[PDB]
From a paper:
DPA is a competitive inhibitor of DHDPR and has a structure similar to DHDP, a PaDHDPR substrate. The crystal structure of DPA-bound PaDHDPR was also obtained in the hexagonal space group P6422 and solved by molecular replacement using the apo form as a search model. Electron density corresponding to DPA was observed in the substrate-binding site of the C-terminal domain. Structural superposition of apo and DPA-bound PaDHDPR revealed that the two conformations were highly similar, with a root-mean-square deviation of 0.54 Å (over 244 Cα atoms). This suggests that DPA alone cannot induce domain closure of PaDHDPR. The apo and DPA-bound forms of PaDHDPR were in an open state, whereas the DPA/NADPH-bound enzyme was in a closed state. DPA binding in PaDHDPR induced a small change in the α5–β5 loop region; however, it is unlikely that the change was due to DPA binding alone, as the distance between the loop and DPA is approximately 9 Å.
Numbering used by the authors:
A (entry chain A), B (entry chain A), C (entry chain A), D (entry chain A): 0 to 264
The structure:
Amino acid sequence: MMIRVAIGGPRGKMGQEAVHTVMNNENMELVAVLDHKDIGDLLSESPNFPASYEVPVFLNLESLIVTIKPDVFLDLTTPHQVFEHTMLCLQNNVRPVIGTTGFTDEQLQQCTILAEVNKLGCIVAPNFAIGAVLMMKFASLAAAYFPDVEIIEMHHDQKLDAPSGTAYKTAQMIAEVRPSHKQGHPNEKETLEGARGASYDGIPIHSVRLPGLIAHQQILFGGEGQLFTLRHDSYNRQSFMSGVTFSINQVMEIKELVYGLENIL
Amino acid sequence: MMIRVAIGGPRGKMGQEAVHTVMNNENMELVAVLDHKDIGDLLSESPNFPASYEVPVFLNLESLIVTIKPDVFLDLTTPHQVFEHTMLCLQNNVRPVIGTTGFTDEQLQQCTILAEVNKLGCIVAPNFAIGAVLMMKFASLAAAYFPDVEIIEMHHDQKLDAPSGTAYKTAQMIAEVRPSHKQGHPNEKETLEGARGASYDGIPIHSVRLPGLIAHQQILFGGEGQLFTLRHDSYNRQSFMSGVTFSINQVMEIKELVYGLENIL
Amino acid sequence: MMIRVAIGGPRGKMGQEAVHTVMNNENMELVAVLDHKDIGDLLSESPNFPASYEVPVFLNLESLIVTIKPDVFLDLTTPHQVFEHTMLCLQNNVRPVIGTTGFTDEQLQQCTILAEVNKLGCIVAPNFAIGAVLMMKFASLAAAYFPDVEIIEMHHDQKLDAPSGTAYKTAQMIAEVRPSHKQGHPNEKETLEGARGASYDGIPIHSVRLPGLIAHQQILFGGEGQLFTLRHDSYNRQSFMSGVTFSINQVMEIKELVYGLENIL
Amino acid sequence: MMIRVAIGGPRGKMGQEAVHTVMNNENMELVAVLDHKDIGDLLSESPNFPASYEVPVFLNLESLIVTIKPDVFLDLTTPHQVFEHTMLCLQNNVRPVIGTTGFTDEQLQQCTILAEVNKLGCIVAPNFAIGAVLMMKFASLAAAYFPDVEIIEMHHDQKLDAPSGTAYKTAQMIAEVRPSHKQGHPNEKETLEGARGASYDGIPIHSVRLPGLIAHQQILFGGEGQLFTLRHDSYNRQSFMSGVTFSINQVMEIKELVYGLENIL
Ligand SMILES: O=C(O)c1cccc(C(=O)O)n1
Ligand SMILES: O=C(O)c1cccc(C(=O)O)n1
Ligand SMILES: O=C(O)c1cccc(C(=O)O)n1
Ligand SMILES: O=C(O)c1cccc(C(=O)O)n1
């Protein structure tokens, strides 16, 4: 059936893309947004979400829920609001799809148990890019056969952290499967400090930062006589959208909370 | 427990590698070979398999089986011999791992049924390179999320067929999942014939042939704002060996016939 | 000294980038544009170039030249106007940098001779992307050492022509150096038509068309035991800008007409 | 004319390839080797260079020179012998091509001056792989246009040094052209030590070590909206041979000493 979607935080960089995605998906209708602005935001610099009869703007989620009764709520707001949003949806027969981290352990347990008792789907997706998540999922399967692996991630030269969050998560996922070991000859020595990169559980990770690049990762699996590589290249925030689409479709089909798209792709 | 292995066709390019692999695997012992030479093979050009007490040479498989009672028979002989070999093993409590094609439909059905009734493992592996098979397996999973794909395969410049067998199999595997469609703008036109490549069920396939190269494949999955690529590079026949190893280990654990390592990785 | 630049066709996709480039380059000042609109262009859909005192809009180039006396005129207009523009600049001590093709043989000869007699620089740049032009220039140098080469170009799936103009030019440039020969085993045969691609003077060219991609080319040089690859990836029209910048800087230094940035990088 | 070649150190890994190369080159004849064995080398483990009338074995270079009068001497011996060899050739009208380092500054100056006065060619080639040297040469040209660059080198997992000698030389060559600067955001911070790699004059260098790999390097040049990459992959010591071939051909044509094939490709 049609899926009636409300979006929290439509004006964010991700939010703007999600709006366009939901509006363009044949089987989805954007029916409301949860939104509010900084009290000092000049309209000339920081416009309102555009006024329409078809997509009313609410300040309060309870009110949105009771008035619009969306099937799904896509939360692209902030870590400090996700728990209260999720619980509110789950108690009102709305499936929440949450696009940021921020739950405590205890908070997540409460949402998980509530989803299960209500037999209502919930997806928490710290990464919506299906290509990035498949990359990670497949890497952790591959690591059963090729325990020697390196990760190379590349981003634009304004990025403040190295390695990337994606690279860290990737290494964590591999390390669930791959026996812990270091790599490289036991007696190798760097003659220029840092050449071998960082190490997560023995997995080398290298971080490239150059103008021009957006977000890119390769995972290299070595073995006798061969190399098996997984690679993801993201050129813009549309890379996230097939994950938004999949999440909204799939939340309607499941009856429990799933954390991480790797657990359902 | 230790796995006692006999190899048919030890002197082949693949056979030579398989010999070394089995001899070097901690939990395996090479206990016999099935071998024979062309009556015109001068020893100076085409040496005998090297004489040893530990690895006796048999001309007849029945005799090898009764005398040596191997756990596993690794068949690297020819398509015209695989069926008779497989049946003989299956009736004598030997697990056959077959490394070439050549069964008829009817032949395969007979081996499958016999394996099942005897509760004895059999693996038929048209491709032993785990990296190549993972590539294909993962591609067919990925194609559920990214229906637009191209295959680029690259080989040395002595190769007679284009596209490669691997590329064909890859396209067949993808096409099980991917809805049939052509790709590229409906009105595109080649101004130099062939630029867009070959097409298998709408999937473009491109074949590179250059000195220097060995055997290489990339699978490119496009979607909005991103590219997800799987790649395998083989530099020599050791690329096959982890598949030989996995097959020998795994045949001991299963109680039926499996055709294609994608069905058990 | 500062370089005072006027741009013809500021509202084009390329023009818009060139405007931003010139405005942001420390040693350049945008002093005028040559521009005019379709008589049916509603302002609401097709806005005017934005009004400013610093960048006056002219309809007639002669008038721009006499009034503003720019050092350089960057022509991003159309093939049918480039010759008249170039000649007008060259006769008025303005260095023209022309960013589209469209000269006849006879037309180009006239501009070349006039530039030489006036000792005034002119650059005609059919491709402003320095990375793409270096790729081509280096490929033609490499082809002296590695005569066996293939070209793989990849674009978005709205592109109408295969192969790309860049791929064609690349093949033409290589073919100046590389002895003419076909590649691949003499007896190879395609079992799926088109797998080996198109051929330009024996050079195979393959064309990939996928959503997600922008504009990409790899040139693969094979030889014994090795592969040497040149690759260019363009994610947006800023890829062109370092070529615009280089052309404007370099036209001031030369005293003759140069056709193709490969001839001066 | 035919080029009559003698090789010093024919039994080395490189030497063996050079022997095959010279023997297979149409315009070259292998006419002698300079060779000797360790006094403890059992013939069963460490065979003699194979006896032939066409390729006599000498222990002393002076004797080889006077007896055989080769056109070219290819020195694949050791750093402690190259100077004495080079001088001896240069004084006897033999062109030396030297395939290992080991000269002092003063030693090289003596050979350079002697070559120049005798108008006799000499090539010193610390790297014979033309694809690797072109990569480096082209990188240093590219760095004039794209000052932001990173180097990724990849080798097998038995390699003791990181980064590679090739990567170091590459960085040195780039740094002749590229203005010295660091890259990445000024405030970036590693949260896992080493992620950003090593730095040579601000150029990041990353070192991958995996089974399967042989010797591989990519050089990534970033700029607005684009990436320009140079890559070399070596699968065996034949990668060196086109450089041996080029060096022997080119030494006959030059009348002075050239150090590094980048200076003559
Ligand atoms: O994994 C990450 O940290 C990541 C992913 C996409 C973009 C960026 C970024 O631009 O910083 N960072
Ligand atoms: O898929 C194939 O056809 C294939 C695989 C490995 C090597 C070769 C070959 O060398 O021909 N061909
Ligand atoms: O070489 C070409 O033809 C080319 C270059 C950049 C973009 C495009 C395109 O988008 O069509 N085509
Ligand atoms: O640049 C180098 O250091 C290099 C080049 C080729 C091979 C190797 C190696 O195997 O160590 N190292």
